[PDB]
Amino acid sequence: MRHYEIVFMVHPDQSEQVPGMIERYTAAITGAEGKIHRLEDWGRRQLAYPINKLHKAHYVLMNVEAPQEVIDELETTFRFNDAVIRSMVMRTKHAVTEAS
């Protein structure tokens, strides 16, 4: 299977809904097949430049093995979700801890 290095950035303001979002995301991936080797929810973090004058938004990284389906349904959930801004998914990584 393919290891994916996913990262997304979610609204500062919605941080009380954040743990609810982290549970529903990682459930939908790991229910199918997926297996967490890094999951991190960074907390607030002031931006290097302010994206459309937004500020301090939360960073959320993952490293998961996944089938091609659930990363698609995650990416389309990122295109869906209007409380989430920028998103990336990247190559294998092969399991990591901290360095944030």
Added chain:
Amino acid sequence: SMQDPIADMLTRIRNGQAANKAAVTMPSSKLKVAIANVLKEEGFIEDFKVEGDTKPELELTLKYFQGKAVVESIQRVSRPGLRIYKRKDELPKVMAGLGIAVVSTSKGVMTDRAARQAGLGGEIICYVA
């Protein structure tokens, strides 16, 4: 591809003489050795020697003169892509007879000097000067 290894071997000779290396290595074969025997017979090379089974390597020791190459020139007369025959009543020669050609006759690979006395024509191979 290595279309003719025989003209290659003679070219490795003429390159070897120009670069002034005594030992020249090449893959062995039957007529190559028989040509190397004609070279040693005529006396323009010192000796050949061979090693292999799966991949033979003929190693031919070329002579040198006191202040010169032993070989003046060496050329493939009947080219791979065009085979040329000369009969008993007229056989070619090199440098007014002083040099030799190499000729494959029915009775084998000879020089022109021996082949004219031997009295049969055939395929000329190369001019050793």
Added chain:
Amino acid sequence: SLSTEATAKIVSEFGRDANDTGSTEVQVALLTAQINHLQGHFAEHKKDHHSRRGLLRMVSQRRKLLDYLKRKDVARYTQLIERLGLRR
């Protein structure tokens, strides 16, 4: 490239004893299964001419190999072309 599971399957399948990769029968099947798999890739797109070169590279080579097995033996050739299913 074709799958590792496909390569390790086909060598035991169309081959003889173990390790029979180099022999023509596996080769023809491997190139054909590659060509069939690439048939979907060129089903969509049709602008990728250099990818089509990588297709056409397998096509003539498999075809030339087939001429080799033909000149060696017609019975294995005719039996091979029928089992895979090719050649008008």
Added chain:
Amino acid sequence: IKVRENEPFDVALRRFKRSCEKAGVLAEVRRREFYEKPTTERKRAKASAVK
């Protein structure tokens, strides 16, 4: 970007920006047309830099 000098900065003598690249980077896109242009530029500069 800008000067941001310490407390005794005198009559605005820009220590930082005088060291900076200034109007070189400003000129760099400026110069009229570009699309065909730098094809002959390559290597001829670099070829000069030998001992």
Added chain:
Amino acid sequence: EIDYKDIATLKNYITESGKIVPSRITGTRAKYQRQLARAIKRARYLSLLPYTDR
């Protein structure tokens, strides 16, 4: 190695405007510079480090 999440390090290879320091300067070798520049654009994309301020 060449992670974009190396943002503590990648500051050394940017000037005040956020422009990249080239391969002549940095003590790198040609491979690691390509991975570095690639990582910097990824870091730039997420606003972990900046494309440029202004």
Added chain:
RNA sequence: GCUUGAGUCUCGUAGAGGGGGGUAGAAUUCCAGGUGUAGCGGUGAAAUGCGUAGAGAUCUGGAGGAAUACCGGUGGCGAAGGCGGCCCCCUGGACGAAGACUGACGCUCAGGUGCGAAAGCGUGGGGAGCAAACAGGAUUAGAUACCCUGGUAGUCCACGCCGUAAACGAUGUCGACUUGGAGGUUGUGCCCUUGAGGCGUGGCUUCCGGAGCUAACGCGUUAAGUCGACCGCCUGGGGAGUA
């Protein structure tokens, strides 16, 4: 029959390889609105133009299409054309490493077939800049040019067509051999590893050069050296790559 050629498997490397789709910053202009007031713009020198009907200027937002600064290199990759934001999906090839198997399956190829920048054409979209045409103002003996202000087709996209370029290293392709240096670029084994190190070995590639060759200029282990295999093409210039 055999294995060094060739082909192929296993494990990797590098990379603007290709298409397809989504998505970003950054920059210009327009559009709408706020503050602010006689110049602005443009030139070697000026005028046409724009501006008190509030411009240019400045500020805030929006709209729209393009192109990817920086890093980027006398770097990379691709048959050639050519390809520089980000990410994914599909997907091409070269090279290394050890090890394995097939066993001449090769090399070249007229006819034939495919690909093939820019311009241009067909149909329907899109059009921020720029820019043939074309207009006007300058220059000039003349200026339908250079110069300057505007500005349409086109430049953009989909799907078709055109098959041409100094499509050039002005080097046909393939293979063997023949002194080198100083580099670049990229894999990998050996070693006291103390090092952004040391001793090696392969592929590609740049500059300088030996014999040699060449009419000279220069080319020169990537040959325009020394040889073989095959294919193309040439026979005064102009008339003509025209009838």
Added chain:
RNA sequence: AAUAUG
């Protein structure tokens, strides 16, 4: 700046 012909 700008400068034509023998």
